[PDB]
Design an enzyme around this catalytic site. Structure first.
Site, mmCIF file in Angstrom:
data_model
loop_
_atom_site.group_PDB
_atom_site.id
_atom_site.type_symbol
_atom_site.label_atom_id
_atom_site.label_comp_id
_atom_site.label_asym_id
_atom_site.label_seq_id
_atom_site.Cartn_x
_atom_site.Cartn_y
_atom_site.Cartn_z
ATOM 1 N N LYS A 175 2.164 4.659 -0.769
ATOM 2 C CA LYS A 175 1.640 5.897 -1.349
ATOM 3 C C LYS A 175 2.233 7.123 -0.662
ATOM 4 O O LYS A 175 2.902 6.977 0.337
ATOM 5 C CB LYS A 175 0.133 5.891 -1.249
ATOM 6 C CG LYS A 175 -0.450 5.764 0.128
ATOM 7 C CD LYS A 175 -1.878 5.266 -0.041
ATOM 8 C CE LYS A 175 -2.549 5.083 1.287
ATOM 9 N NZ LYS A 175 -1.955 3.872 1.906
ATOM 10 N N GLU A 182 -21.639 27.740 -7.692
ATOM 11 C CA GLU A 182 -20.533 27.837 -6.751
ATOM 12 C C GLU A 182 -21.109 27.881 -5.350
ATOM 13 O O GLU A 182 -22.255 28.256 -5.179
ATOM 14 C CB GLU A 182 -19.690 29.086 -7.019
ATOM 15 C CG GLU A 182 -20.317 30.382 -6.498
ATOM 16 C CD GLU A 182 -19.581 31.629 -6.957
ATOM 17 O OE1 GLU A 182 -18.501 31.488 -7.573
ATOM 18 O OE2 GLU A 182 -20.089 32.750 -6.693
ATOM 19 N N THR A 189 -5.930 5.587 -2.438
ATOM 20 C CA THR A 189 -5.332 4.278 -2.661
ATOM 21 C C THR A 189 -5.256 3.888 -4.117
ATOM 22 O O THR A 189 -4.276 3.313 -4.540
ATOM 23 C CB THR A 189 -6.047 3.167 -1.883
ATOM 24 O OG1 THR A 189 -7.442 3.195 -2.182
ATOM 25 C CG2 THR A 189 -5.896 3.370 -0.379
ATOM 26 N N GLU A 193 -22.436 26.826 2.844
ATOM 27 C CA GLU A 193 -23.179 26.072 1.854
ATOM 28 C C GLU A 193 -22.552 24.674 1.601
ATOM 29 O O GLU A 193 -23.252 23.663 1.542
ATOM 30 C CB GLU A 193 -23.262 26.865 0.536
ATOM 31 C CG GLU A 193 -24.264 27.993 0.562
ATOM 32 C CD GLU A 193 -24.096 29.070 -0.521
ATOM 33 O OE1 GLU A 193 -23.208 29.003 -1.370
ATOM 34 O OE2 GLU A 193 -24.864 30.060 -0.509
ATOM 35 N N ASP A 214 4.214 1.856 7.728
ATOM 36 C CA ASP A 214 3.270 0.798 7.437
ATOM 37 C C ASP A 214 3.824 -0.409 6.674
ATOM 38 O O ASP A 214 3.061 -1.263 6.258
ATOM 39 C CB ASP A 214 1.997 1.341 6.755
ATOM 40 C CG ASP A 214 1.103 2.180 7.691
ATOM 41 O OD1 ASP A 214 1.426 2.334 8.913
ATOM 42 O OD2 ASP A 214 0.069 2.723 7.154
ATOM 43 N N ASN A 260 2.382 7.589 3.221
ATOM 44 C CA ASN A 260 3.281 6.706 3.941
ATOM 45 C C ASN A 260 4.741 7.102 3.855
ATOM 46 O O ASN A 260 5.603 6.413 4.383
ATOM 47 C CB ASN A 260 3.124 5.279 3.448
ATOM 48 C CG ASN A 260 1.806 4.674 3.872
ATOM 49 O OD1 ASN A 260 1.263 5.025 4.905
ATOM 50 N ND2 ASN A 260 1.300 3.769 3.100
ATOM 51 N N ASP A 317 0.800 -1.231 0.000
ATOM 52 C CA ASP A 317 0.000 0.000 0.000
ATOM 53 C C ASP A 317 0.820 1.262 0.000
ATOM 54 O O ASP A 317 0.402 2.284 0.537
ATOM 55 C CB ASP A 317 -0.927 0.005 1.201
ATOM 56 C CG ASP A 317 -1.924 -1.154 1.167
ATOM 57 O OD1 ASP A 317 -2.327 -1.587 0.046
ATOM 58 O OD2 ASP A 317 -2.333 -1.631 2.261
#
Ligand SMILES: CCOc1ccc2ccc(-c3nn(CC(C)C)c4ncnc(N)c34)cc2c1
Length: 460
Positions: A134, A444, A172, A449, A153, A137, A132
């Site tokens: 990325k 917008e 991911t 909002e 990790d 990490n 994993d």
């Protein structure tokens, strides 16, 4: 007898949420050593391996040592949780630091990627795969500037099953190797992921992209990407050659981590080189979008958790209030708040009895009530819960401000499309909710909002 995590460590504060659990800054009650503990909830994260196999991996990881790899110090386990205790890093996520710099060259990228490949090479020698990998990490060791990258990790994904929840999935899909999707994978998946990260460092856009998670996954699985974007014109042939070799589809033909370290591009650029300004710009936009979608999902979660914990807490106190006059003392509020944590698993922050006493006292000290008398529980419930959310409500706001780089006060509909796509909120669902909030057709939204849309997207 089993050793107990909170016999040895007290929690200072929450550092954040990463894969498989919350990470808490903790301190050894005797030596004063600070550490970063990842707390994995068994209710929420299923194991893939037997206890035996996990214990042996932990034992190996405690012995491994490399400057680009997070040091693991201890491991604990009880009825509800696993506690992974490791070294604290204070430099934050790599991409968060990169967006803050004025220039960024291939030399800077090569020095980063060398570090990542060096960590990975070492882990591979030890038969540990990340899977994993990325940007989140990759942490910088400190807030200095020649700081080393520490990869976190490593080894986790082999022993624990990934969340299927989008709030835990953000980001991911860009990075995952195609072979991981199909089930037959080995350590080469980590070279692919690094190739993706490098493609991003040098262009600022994901090589495999799409309007939602599944569209991204579809591109990844086909495995096709190009270097036809304008900002690739500024980039060396050797860098694109390495990228090609890392993003080679069939793993057996993909370059290894160790061999990538010897690639011409790493050699040349890590021992008259322009800044990649367009890439920095694209990365800061990519980052801001990712961070805002993450904050939006956490905010929605936090609202639901609150709805759940507010009513639970009131029922606990009603039951406790034997006389039924609405009045409990401080030890009772503590016992009820404990009762709530016993039932919940959400607070890694409330590790032991003593963190809960403190949290109760924080609420009392805000609520203008004496801690030594009897207290109206309904008022205490109201204050206690805002405490937990506003962290996420103010981080939502903070993330809306960071995304609004022009200080326009507004997010455009196009930007909303992007944000909700990353957040994997169905397109007709958010438009529907935007229709109900934007009745002037401005196309917008301001912050209030935007927040209202999210409340409507979580049943409010
Ligand atoms: C086998 C590796 O499994 C682990 C074990 C412990 C960890 C502790 C902290 C972290 C960690 N995670 N995070 C990032 C959080 C803020 C999302 C850290 N920030 C600073 N220092 C740290 N050490 C961390 C990750 C862990 C991963």
């Amino acid at each position: 007898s089993t050793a107990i995590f909170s016999d040895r460590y007290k929690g200072q504060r929450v550092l954040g949420k990463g894969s498989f659990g919350e990470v808490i800054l903790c301190k050894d009650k005797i030596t004063g050593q600070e550490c970063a503990v990842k707390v994995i909830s068994k209710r929420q994260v299923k194991q893939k391996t037997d206890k035996e196999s996990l214990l042996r991996e932990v034992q190996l990881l405690k012995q491994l040592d490399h400057p680009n790899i997070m040091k693991l110090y201890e491991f604990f386990e009880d009825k509800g949780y696993f506690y992974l205790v490791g070294e604290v890093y204070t430099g934050g996520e790599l991409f968060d630091e990169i967006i803050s710099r004025k220039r960024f060259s291939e030399v800077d990228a090569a020095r980063i990627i060398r570090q990542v490949l060096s960590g990975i090479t070492y882990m591979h020698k030890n038969k540990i795969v990340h899977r994993d990998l990325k940007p989140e990490n990759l942490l910088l060791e400190s807030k200095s500037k020649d700081a080393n990258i520490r990869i976190i990790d490593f080894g986790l994904s082999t022993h624990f099953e990934a969340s299927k929840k989008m709030k835990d999935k953000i980001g991911t899909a860009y990075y995952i190797a195609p072979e991981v999707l199909h089930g037959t994978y080995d350590e080469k998946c980590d070279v692919w992921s690094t190739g993706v990260i490098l493609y991003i460092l040098l262009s600022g856009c994901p090589p495999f992209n799409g309007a939602n998670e599944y569209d991204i996954l579809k591109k990844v699985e086909k495995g096709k990407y190009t270097f036809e974007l304008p900002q690739w014109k500024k980039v060396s042939e050797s860098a694109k050659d390495l990228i090609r070799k890392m993003l080679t589809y069939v793993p057996s033909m993909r370059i290894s981590a160790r061999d990538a370290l010897d690639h011409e591009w790493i050699q040349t650029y890590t021992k008259d080189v322009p800044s990649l300004d367009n890439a920095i710009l694209n990365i800061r936009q990519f980052q801001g979008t990712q961070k805002l979608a993450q904050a939006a999902l956490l905010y929605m979660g936090s609202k639901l958790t609150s709805q759940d914990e507010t009513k639970e807490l009131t029922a606990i106190f009603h039951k406790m209030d034997k006389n039924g006059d609405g009045q409990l003392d401080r030890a009772e509020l503590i016992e009820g708040y404990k009762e709530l944590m016993r039932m919940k698993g959400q607070d890694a922050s409330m590790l032991d009895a003593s963190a809960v006493e403190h949290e109760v006292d924080q609420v009392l000290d805000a609520v203008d009530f004496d801690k030594n008398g009897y207290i109206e529980y309904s008022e205490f419930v109201t204050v206690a819960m805002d405490r937990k959310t506003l962290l996420s409500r103010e981080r939502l706001e903070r993330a809306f401000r960071m995304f609004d780089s022009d200080n326009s006060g507004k997010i455009s509909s196009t930007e909303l499309a992007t944000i909700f796509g990353v957040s994997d909120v169905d397109s007709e669902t958010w438009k529907s909710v935007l229709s109900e909030v934007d009745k002037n057709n401005d196309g917008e939204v301001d912050f209030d909002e935007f927040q209202q849309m999210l409340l409507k997207l979580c049943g409010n």
